[PDB]
Design a protein around this nucleic acid. Structure first.
Ligand SMILES: [Zn+2]
Length: 171
DNA sequence: CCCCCCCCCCC
């Protein structure tokens, strides 16, 4: 049957759990957790100094990229399915080992290096190591917009199916 | 060699 966790950490609802609730508290035990939506308002307040972690839904896997050094990497759109997103850069092993992940997945991110751009591009974080990514499961509220683009292509914006079936762009 | 690696959709 359906098995849904209503997580206090991420503030998300997760199905297809890859771990027990006890295992969650263990991973987050000695770590300062910051909600993925609080991130942009948390820059420059010593929130990311020590060991920290966040968690969000994979909204967009973007396109294949190549580093200046010639290595491949990823740029993910992550969020809590609430009109607010954030950029995640997957480098090296992290990209190798998680670039095939499915949109809708719920990932815990550990100790990402933070970049904040007050020029409009906003909050972003990056990780490069395998243990910096933990798939907790699948967002039970995740869905794709049922609306269509201007050119007739099905919209691929992530939505909260519990609160509606369309983007900010479709109403 | 390792670490490093860094953004123009959907209105
Ligand atoms: Zn749409």
């Amino acid at each position: 049957s359906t098995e849904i966790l209503v997580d206090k950490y991420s503030g998300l609802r997760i199905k297809h759990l890859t771990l027990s609730p006890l295992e969650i508290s263990n991973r987050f035990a000695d770590i300062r957790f910051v909600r993925i939506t609080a991130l942009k308002n948390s820059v420059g307040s010593d929130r990311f100094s020590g060991c920290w972690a966040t968690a969000g839904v994979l909204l967009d896997k973007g396109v294949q990229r190549v580093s200046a050094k010639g290595s491949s990497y990823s740029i993910w759109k992550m969020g809590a399915l609430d009109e607010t997103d954030v950029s995640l850069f997957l480098f090296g092993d992290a990209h190798v080992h998680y670039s095939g992940a499915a949109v809708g997945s719920v990932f815990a991110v550990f100790n990402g290096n933070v970049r904040m751009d007050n020029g409009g591009k906003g909050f972003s974080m990056s990780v490069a190591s395998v243990g910096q990514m933990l798939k907790m499961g699948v967002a039970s509220d995740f869905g794709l917009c049922k609306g269509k683009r201007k050119d007739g292509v099905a919209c691929t914006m992530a939505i909260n199916k519990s609160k509606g079936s369309y983007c900010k762009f479709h109403s």
